[PDB]
Structure formats: C-alpha cells, structure tokens
Ligand SMILES: [Ca+2]
Ligand SMILES: [Ca+2]
Ligand SMILES: [Ca+2]
Ligand SMILES: [Ca+2]
C-alpha cells in the first residue's frame with residue numbers, strides 16, 4: 001500500500017519484544033519499506049487461500065497472541081534479507097530486490113512452513129508437534145533460501161538434487177541463525193518443535209542420525225517416499241557441511257574445520273555459479289571444490305577440507 005514508513009513494536013512467538021517496520025495509511029500495515037522493494041506480511045485467517053489480507057493493525061502495537069506469528073514472519077524475513085545483502089551482496093531472493101511476501105495463520109493446526117514458488121507460508125502448528133513456525137529463525141531462512149535456490153541453481157526437488165536443495169536450505173537457515181546470534185546451533189527447528197520436550201529438533205546437521213537420517217552415502221534412502229527422501233538424504237550433505245565448518249573425525253576420516261563464514265562463501269558460490277537443476281551429490285562435491293578453488297586457491301586448506309568432508313560422508 002502507499003503510505004509513510006513507521007516503526008511498530010510487538011512480541012514474537014517466543015515472547016520476545018522486537019521493533020518492526022510498518023506502513024501507515026489509516027491502519028498500520030506489516031509492510032517494511034526499508035528493505036528492497038518491500039517486505040509484506042499477510043493474514044491467511046486460518047484458511048488456505050493465499051496470500052490473504054495484508055496485515056492491518058489499528059495502533060502499531062503487536063502484542064496480542066494472534067499477532068505473534070506475524071511479528072516473527074515479518075522480522076525474520078528482514079533478518080534473512082539482511083544476511084544475504086550484507087554477507088553475499090545479494091539483493092533479496094532474486095538478486096533484484098523482489099518483494100518478500102509471507103502469510104501466517106495458514107490453515108488450522110498446520111505443522112509446516114513452506115515457500116510456494118511466490119511467497120512464504122506459515123502454519124500455526126497444532127500446539128503439540130509445533131508452535132507457530134515463523135518463531136524459528138532457521139525455519140524462516142530455510143524456506144526463503146528455497147526462493148534463492150529456485151532463482152539460481154534450480155535444483156529439482158526430487159532424489160539427490162532435491163536432497164541438495166533441502167541441505168542448502170538447512171545450511172543457510174543455520175548460518176542466518178548464527179548471524180542473528182540468538183541461541184545458534186546446528187539443529188533445525190528447535191525453537192518451534194515440540195514445546196513439551198526440550199533438547200530435540202526436526203533434524204540435526206552435526207549428527208543427522210540422532211533422528212534416523214543418513215550421515216553417509218552408503219546409508220542413503222533409495223525409495224520413493226518424500227520425493228525420493230529429500231528431507232532424509234539431506235543428512236549426508238548437512239553432515240558434510242557441518243564437517244567443513246566445524247571439523248571432526250567421521251567414520252575414521254578427519255576433517256579440518258574452516259569455520260562458518262567460509263562454509264557460507266563456498267556454498268553460496270557453488271549454489272550461484274556451478275550447481276544446475278539436475279546436480280547430484282558427486283556434482284555438488286565438484287562444485288564445492290571448484291568454488292573453494294576460486295576463493296582460496298587450489299592448494300588451500302579450504303579446498304583440502306572440502307575434499308576431506310565429502311570423503312567422510314562417502315561422496316566422491
Ligand atoms: Ca495492535
Ligand atoms: Ca537455536
Ligand atoms: Ca537451529
Ligand atoms: Ca522441543
């Protein structure tokens with residue numbers, strides 16, 4: 001909507017107060033004009049018609065329980081925007097400041113969040129398996145990263161390119177979580193998963209096997225469920241990424257860690273310059289090696305560590 005930029009205040013899903021960029025014109029709307037061509041957050045009102053209505057509030061205060069998922073979808077979209085711009089010089093998900101649109105209160109008891117090809121969509125969870133999923137910065141940045149991938153490598157969402165697509169989203173969702181630097185970890189979804197159980201999450205990058213996901217190519221899933229296991233075999237690549245950043249010895253193979261920033265540069269460059277829609281795991285290894293070669297040189301530790309990491313998960 002046309003209006004003047006303002007700053008509202010509210011509480012997110014986890015009860016934390018944050019300021020949010022809004023737009024005033026009769027109502028205060030969740031429209032942030034300070035980032036690219038705008039960040040816009042919508043109310044799906046428990047139904048499934050999208051995007052629903054641009055979020056309107058009479059007084060620019062967003063402290064009602066119903067407001068919380070919107071506050072966090074809006075704010076963490078901005079954090080994700082900031083990460084890609086400041087860390088990778090990328091302006092929004094298309095690299096040309098496309099508007100970022102999000103809808104919350106999608107459906108009823110909906111235990112998921114997703115990028116639909118055009119926007120982000122967040123369920124509220126059923127209160128048991130999940131609380132509103134925009135409360136998880138890694139979930140928000142994971143699904144916004146699917147938009148980045150769709151505009152760059154274009155990894156097809158099935159089989160190994162699909163598991164790479166998923167891992168790329170887990171990798172950058174986690175790096176955005178470290179960027180925001182609030183209780184960061186290498187798990188996925190922990191802030192919004194199972195409020196009745198502490199210490200768990202949807203997936204783990206540092207030990208995928210904690211949830212029955214493979215941590216080596218010899219344990220890959222080859223059936224047809226889950227689009228050929230894209231949320232399962234993503235564990236193989238998540239482990240590789242974790243090892244590249246943090247190092248460790250995995251099934252006897254030692255990896256020298258090079259840290260998060262370099263993991264992020266290498267995988268960003270792979271995603272945007274070398275991966276293609278049909279890339280498989282072995283092709284990702286090559287892309288990552290070449291990216292590390294470009295950035296740090298063929299004889300670098302960075303290249304050697306990337307190779308160690310893919311050897312450790314059985315990917316040649
Ligand atoms: Ca209000
Ligand atoms: Ca965390
Ligand atoms: Ca996390
Ligand atoms: Ca939990």
Ligand SMILES: [Ru+3]
Nearest residue numbers: 143146166169
């Ligand atoms: Ru996903």
